[PDB]
Structure formats: C-alpha cells, structure tokens
C-alpha cells in the first residue's frame, strides 16, 4: 503493498537487465522509460502532442518487474523528463486507487 | 471506492459551487483546475517549467468534495489541458495505490 501519496510514488523496476526507478503515474496512459536497451522489433509511436509530438520506440510484450511483480506489457523507450509507469502496466500488476 | 486503471480515473468533484470532472493523477504534486471562481485571497505560483513556467493563482484551504469526500486543500486555478487532482488532495481523501 500500500503506497500512500505524501511523497512521489517512485518504485524500483527491473527491465532490460537493469534496475531503474520510475514513477507510478495514474495520469499517464503509457509507460515511458529513458536509456533502456530492449531487444527485438519495435515500431515508432508519436506521444505527447502539445506543441508537437515526440517520437519514441514502442516495444510490445516486454517482461518487466515492478516491486517484484513480474508482468508483461508495452514499454515506450525514449526521452522523458522522468521514467513513468503508466496505467497500461499498473493494470497488469493489479494496482488500484483506494479511499 | 476502489478504482481500477483500465480507463483514466476521472471523478466528479464539487468546488466553488460547481460540479466538475477531474483526473486522479498520482504523477502530479498539485491540484490544478480550469474555469472555477474561488473567493478570497490568493498568491501567484509558477508551475510546469519545461519550456517556460505557467503562472496560476494558488488558493489555500479550499473546501472541495472529491467523489463524496469533503476535504480541505490547496487548489491552483489556471489553464490546464485537463483538470487534475494531484497528490496534495489525494492524501486528504486518504487515497492510496494498492497491489
């Protein structure tokens, strides 16, 4: 687990053979990570859009571990001011908002 | 309630005598709403920052009802692509992330 929100909900993830920190972001549809090298095929995706779009690489069905929950999901790899776990992966780990 | 994350977690809020919709956004430190008229004193606040800052009006101790919970917190009033409930108000309602 239960994560309170007095601080930014930054968690450790395991991806592309690396440990990284990322923000559990319910405001984000997608997961975007900087400086990960993932294997295999990808397709470009345009994200953002206000003032222009940013092009990133979309990788599908990526194994990723978030707080020791091993799940599978789409990871966008590209420039992001901060690493973000979006709703697409939060559903996989069964993460909910509760009050 | 328990809110799953397959869709954007948009909720009804009651503020400044109006019903509004806003996104429960764990990636946002603060709460920013468009087109609400709040009474009394405020101070300017600079938010954002990437490419420039946005000036908004900061109102403190604002009564707001989020999804049936009456709470008190800081509301920033100004242009925002979408109305956002940030962590500052999620703590007040006792909202947590759980998996």
């Amino acid at each position: 687990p239960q994560i309170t929100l007095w601080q930014r909900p930054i968690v450790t993830i395991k991806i592309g053979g690396q440990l990284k920190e990322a923000l559990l972001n319910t405001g984000a549809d997608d997961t975007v990570l900087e400086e990960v090298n993932l294997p295999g095929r990808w397709k470009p995706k345009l994200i953002g859009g206000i003032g222009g779009f940013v092009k990133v690489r979309q990788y599908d069905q990526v194994p990723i571990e978030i707080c020791g929950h091993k799940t599978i999901g789409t990871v966008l790899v590209g420039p992001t001011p901060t690493n973000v776990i979006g709703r697409n992966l939060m559903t996989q780990i069964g993460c909910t908002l509760n009050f | 309630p328990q809110i799953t994350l397959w869709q954007r977690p948009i909720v009804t809020i009651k503020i400044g005598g109006q019903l509004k919709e806003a996104l429960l956004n764990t990636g946002a430190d603060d709460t920013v709403l468009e087109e609400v008229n709040l009474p009394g004193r405020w101070k300017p606040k600079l938010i954002g920052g990437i490419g420039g800052f946005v000036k908004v009006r900061q109102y403190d101790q604002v009564p707001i009802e989020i999804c049936g919970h009456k709470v008190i917190g800081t509301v920033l009033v100004g242009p925002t692509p979408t109305n956002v409930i940030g962590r500052n108000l999620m703590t007040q309602i006792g909202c947590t992330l759980n998996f």
């Binding site: 405001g27 859009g49 001011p81 901060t82 | 996104l23 946002a28 430190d29 603060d30 920013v32």
Partner: peptide, 7 residues
Amino acid sequence: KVLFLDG
C-alpha cells in the same frame, strides 16, 4: 495523455 506535474 501520459501526464506528470513536477511541483
């Protein structure tokens, strides 16, 4: 879309 708010 995907949405932050440093602050």
